[PDB]
Design a protein around this ligand. Structure first.
Ligand code: HEC
Length: 107
């Protein structure tokens, strides 16, 4: 149960808040964070070639709309010890728009 998202608004959030550390396209490079291609339906810790924390790997969830919605509000609360430094997107609408963009761009 996430709010319906606007892909265009979500693309702007992604570029301004996430692209510093993440790519989305197939074959895109790892940066500080993992490439996100195939994210939806991917369990944590699965991007080929990225060195994840044990904390991320142990969370034992599948990335999809609902889990991203909670994670992105406050990453460290959801995965204590994660190496991702990002305070969170507090507004539910910003998370919804971003998630819709990610769903389209990581296919
Ligand atoms: C660099 C300062 C980051 C910013 C800004 C964002 N992310 Fe990130 N992310 C980063 C790291 C180093 C990692 C790995 C964490 C670990 O503990 O190993 C991550 C991880 C994610 C994940 C999980 C991916 C997976 O399990 O394969 C997601 C879904 C994620 N990051 C999303 C994401 C988004 C959408 C961001 C903007 C709101 C964002 N992150 C910013 C580093 C950084």
């Amino acid at each position: 149960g996430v709010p319906a998202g606007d892909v265009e608004k979500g693309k702007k959030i992604f570029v301004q808040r996430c692209a510093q550390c993440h790519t989305v396209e197939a074959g895109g490079k790892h940066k500080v964070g993992p490439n996100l291609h195939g994210l939806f339906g991917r369990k944590t810790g699965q991007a080929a070639g990225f060195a994840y924390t044990d904390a991320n790997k142990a969370k034992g969830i599948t990335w999809n709309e609902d889990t991203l919605f909670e994670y992105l509000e406050n990453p460290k609360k959801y995965i204590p010890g994660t190496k991702m430094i990002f305070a969170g997107l507090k507004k539910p609408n910003e998370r919804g728009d971003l998630i819709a963009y990610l769903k389209s761009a990581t296919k």
